[PDB]
């Protein structure tokens, strides 16, 4: 898979985060590039790919994970990521 678009989903807990990651990867052709434990319960999953693929993946993941567990906190999409942000974005999980 190629592309630089980034899709983010933040959930309160690990079970909704895993569900969202699975839903995203099954719905679209994206890449799971990392899972982050923010602290305080927040867990963030990141996906990379084409813009439309990331759009479909993030929509499906938010819809799937909005109910399981404590719920869904945020679901954001970034078309082009600045080169500086790539330093803080993980490459592989």
């Amino acid at each position: 898979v190629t592309g630089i678009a980034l899709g983010m989903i933040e959930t309160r807990g690990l079970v909704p985060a895993i569900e969202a990651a699975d839903a995203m990867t099954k719905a679209a052709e994206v890449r799971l590039v990392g899972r982050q434990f923010v602290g305080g319960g927040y867990v963030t999953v990141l996906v990379r790919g084409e813009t439309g693929a990331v759009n479909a993946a993030v929509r499906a993941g938010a819809d799937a994970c909005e109910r399981v567990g404590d719920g869904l906190v945020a679901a954001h999409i970034i078309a082009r990521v600045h080169s500086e942000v790539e330093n803080i974005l993980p490459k592989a999980p």
Binding site: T51, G52, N55, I77, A79
Partner: protein, 81 residues
Amino acid sequence: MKIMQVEKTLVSTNRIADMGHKPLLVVWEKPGAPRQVAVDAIGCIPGDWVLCVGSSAAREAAGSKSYPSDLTIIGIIDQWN
């Protein structure tokens, strides 16, 4: 108004929300002319000659008082060379 020829279909996934579901086409006067993108309100295959309106009229031609557009296709020329 301003006569242009449809070149190809243009798709932008990250377009703003209020642009709606309307499609976008790339239109130019002639092969080699500067290219412009026009909101399609009629439906045109590539190649044909269309009427393009600009300024505040294009917003109404798109469909709303506050549609974010500045060049909208309002019709297809019947006969044109």
